[PDB]
Design an enzyme around this catalytic site. Structure first.
Site, PDB file in Angstrom:
ATOM      1  N   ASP A 161       1.598   3.812   7.449  1.00 25.14           N
ATOM      2  CA  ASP A 161       0.402   2.926   7.452  1.00 25.14           C
ATOM      3  C   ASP A 161       0.838   1.519   7.038  1.00 25.14           C
ATOM      4  O   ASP A 161       1.374   1.393   5.927  1.00 25.14           O
ATOM      5  CB  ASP A 161      -0.709   3.481   6.555  1.00 25.14           C
ATOM      6  N   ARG A 196      -0.559   9.075   0.605  1.00 22.78           N
ATOM      7  CA  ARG A 196      -1.535   9.135   1.712  1.00 22.78           C
ATOM      8  C   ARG A 196      -1.040   8.385   2.940  1.00 22.78           C
ATOM      9  O   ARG A 196      -1.509   8.653   4.033  1.00 22.78           O
ATOM     10  CB  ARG A 196      -2.920   8.579   1.278  1.00 22.78           C
ATOM     11  N   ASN A 197      -0.143   7.398   2.758  1.00 18.17           N
ATOM     12  CA  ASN A 197       0.383   6.603   3.872  1.00 18.17           C
ATOM     13  C   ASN A 197       1.743   7.093   4.384  1.00 18.17           C
ATOM     14  O   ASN A 197       2.419   6.362   5.101  1.00 18.17           O
ATOM     15  CB  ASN A 197       0.416   5.108   3.500  1.00 18.17           C
ATOM     16  N   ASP A 236       0.819  -1.210   0.000  1.00 21.36           N
ATOM     17  CA  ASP A 236       0.000   0.000   0.000  1.00 21.36           C
ATOM     18  C   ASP A 236       0.855   1.262   0.000  1.00 21.36           C
ATOM     19  O   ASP A 236       0.650   2.162   0.813  1.00 21.36           O
ATOM     20  CB  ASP A 236      -0.977   0.001   1.210  1.00 21.36           C
TER      21      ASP A 236
HETATM   22  C1  LIG Z   1      -1.154  19.352  10.583  1.00 22.22           C
HETATM   23  N1  LIG Z   1      -2.460  18.704  10.547  1.00 22.22           N
HETATM   24  S1  LIG Z   1      -3.058  18.001  11.874  1.00 22.22           S
HETATM   25  O1  LIG Z   1      -4.361  17.537  11.507  1.00 22.22           O
HETATM   26  O2  LIG Z   1      -2.915  18.928  12.955  1.00 22.22           O
HETATM   27  C2  LIG Z   1      -2.068  16.581  12.237  1.00 22.22           C
HETATM   28  C3  LIG Z   1      -2.415  15.342  11.718  1.00 22.22           C
HETATM   29  C4  LIG Z   1      -1.594  14.252  11.951  1.00 22.22           C
HETATM   30  C5  LIG Z   1      -0.434  14.393  12.703  1.00 22.22           C
HETATM   31  N2  LIG Z   1       0.463  13.347  13.020  1.00 22.22           N
HETATM   32  C6  LIG Z   1       0.380  12.000  13.016  1.00 22.22           C
HETATM   33  N3  LIG Z   1       1.400  11.296  13.508  1.00 22.22           N
HETATM   34  C7  LIG Z   1       1.205   9.977  13.569  1.00 22.22           C
HETATM   35  C8  LIG Z   1       0.058   9.339  13.125  1.00 22.22           C
HETATM   36  C9  LIG Z   1      -0.072   7.852  13.267  1.00 22.22           C
HETATM   37  F1  LIG Z   1      -1.026   7.504  14.123  1.00 22.22           F
HETATM   38  F2  LIG Z   1       1.037   7.279  13.699  1.00 22.22           F
HETATM   39  F3  LIG Z   1      -0.322   7.249  12.119  1.00 22.22           F
HETATM   40  C10 LIG Z   1      -0.944  10.188  12.572  1.00 22.22           C
HETATM   41  N4  LIG Z   1      -2.092   9.680  12.034  1.00 22.22           N
HETATM   42  C11 LIG Z   1      -3.122  10.528  11.430  1.00 22.22           C
HETATM   43  C12 LIG Z   1      -4.033  11.198  12.473  1.00 22.22           C
HETATM   44  C13 LIG Z   1      -5.422  10.679  12.217  1.00 22.22           C
HETATM   45  C14 LIG Z   1      -5.451  10.447  10.757  1.00 22.22           C
HETATM   46  C15 LIG Z   1      -4.102   9.766  10.465  1.00 22.22           C
HETATM   47  N5  LIG Z   1      -3.685   9.846   9.045  1.00 22.22           N
HETATM   48  C16 LIG Z   1      -2.388   9.258   8.755  1.00 22.22           C
HETATM   49  C17 LIG Z   1      -4.686   9.321   8.102  1.00 22.22           C
HETATM   50  N6  LIG Z   1      -0.761  11.513  12.537  1.00 22.22           N
HETATM   51  C18 LIG Z   1      -0.112  15.636  13.230  1.00 22.22           C
HETATM   52  C19 LIG Z   1      -0.924  16.728  13.001  1.00 22.22           C
END
Ligand SMILES: CNS(=O)(=O)c1ccc(Nc2ncc(C(F)(F)F)c(N[C@@H]3CCC[C@H]3N(C)C)n2)cc1
Length: 265
Positions: A153, A139-140, A135
């Site tokens: 991911d 996006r990942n 994948d």
């Molecule tokens: C800058 N935009 S934000 O929305 O504030 C933000 C948005 C993510 C982030 N960091 C961040 N760090 C790690 C992870 C993860 F869990 F390890 F994957 C992560 N996952 C995302 C949060 C929910 C959706 C998912 N994505 C990958 C689909 N996210 C830090 C800030």
């Protein structure tokens, strides 16, 4: 042996940073037993009171515990009591696609090539661990800092849901064959996405019609401002015969040369 189960009293839950497949994801802090407090992403599971849903949710955390690489998001631990949580390291700048889209006229080319180089090192590491990601897409990918991306991911990954047809190698679509060479094809698409500033491949084309275009020799076009040597490398990732694709160790060495050539203008 690394920590897998972590104490809930050592987690401080912060703001919601988005939604995941199993539930909301929050930013937070892990008060590490012998080190400074870490910024973390806490994945929650809405229906994990069911052990069947809990098993599916925790499957990815089981995969992540086996990895340790600077360009792969680190699993900190899990909390198996209700509410079930998966605690990952936080990549402060969020999702790669949104980050590139917002900075399309401000990120220099050397940064885009650096992201592709970093990802190639993570995929050579995965190959060396006998995993097929299956994948690989922008996006990942997550952004730790302006000069650091991480593969984040591992839902479809396998130690050797809707299909991402627009990213898949022809042998994967036609025969369900997933190898390190089919990951190379996907990584070529992911490099195209980075150089296109987070635009999706084959926009406006139906999934069922992607197959025909690929089979007919059609490929994603050269992104504007992409160095020709880098587009040539992408086209080699899209060789129909997987034996003619480069290997991740070759992609890493060639991307390092391309990056160096861009830094010298
Ligand atoms: C800058 N935009 S934000 O929305 O504030 C933000 C948005 C993510 C982030 N960091 C961040 N760090 C790690 C992870 C993860 F869990 F390890 F994957 C992560 N996952 C995302 C949060 C929910 C959706 C998912 N994505 C990958 C689909 N996210 C830090 C800030």
């Amino acid at each position: 042996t690394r920590d897998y189960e972590i104490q809930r009293e050592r987690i401080e839950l912060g703001r919601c940073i988005g939604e995941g497949q199993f539930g909301d994801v929050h930013q937070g802090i892990y008060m590490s037993p012998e080190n400074p407090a870490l910024a973390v992403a806490i994945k929650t599971c809405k229906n994990c009171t069911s052990d069947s849903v809990r098993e599916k949710f925790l499957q990815e955390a089981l995969t992540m515990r086996q990895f340790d690489h600077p360009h792969i998001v680190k699993l900190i631990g899990v909390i198996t009591e209700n509410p079930v949580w998966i605690i990952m390291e936080l990549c402060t700048l969020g999702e790669l696609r949104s980050f590139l889209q917002v900075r399309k006229y401000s990120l220099d080319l050397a940064s885009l090539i650096l992201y592709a180089y970093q990802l190639s090192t993570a995929l050579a590491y995965l190959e060396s661990k006998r995993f097929v990601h299956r994948d690989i897409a922008a996006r990942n990918v997550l952004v730790s800092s302006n000069d650091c991306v991480k593969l984040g991911d591992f839902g479809l990954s396998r130690y050797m849901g809707k299909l991402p047809i627009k990213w898949m190698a022809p042998e994967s679509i036609n025969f369900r064959r997933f190898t390190s060479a089919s990951d190379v094809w996907m990584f070529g698409v992911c490099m195209w996405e980075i150089l296109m500033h987070g635009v999706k491949p084959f926009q406006g084309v139906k999934n069922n019609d992607v197959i025909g275009r690929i089979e007919n020799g059609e490929r994603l076009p050269m992104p504007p401002n992409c160095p020709p040597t880098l587009y040539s490398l992408m086209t080699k990732c899209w060789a129909y015969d997987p034996s003619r694709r480069p290997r991740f160790t070759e992609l890493k060495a060639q991307l390092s040369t391309i990056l160096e050539e861009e830094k010298a203008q």
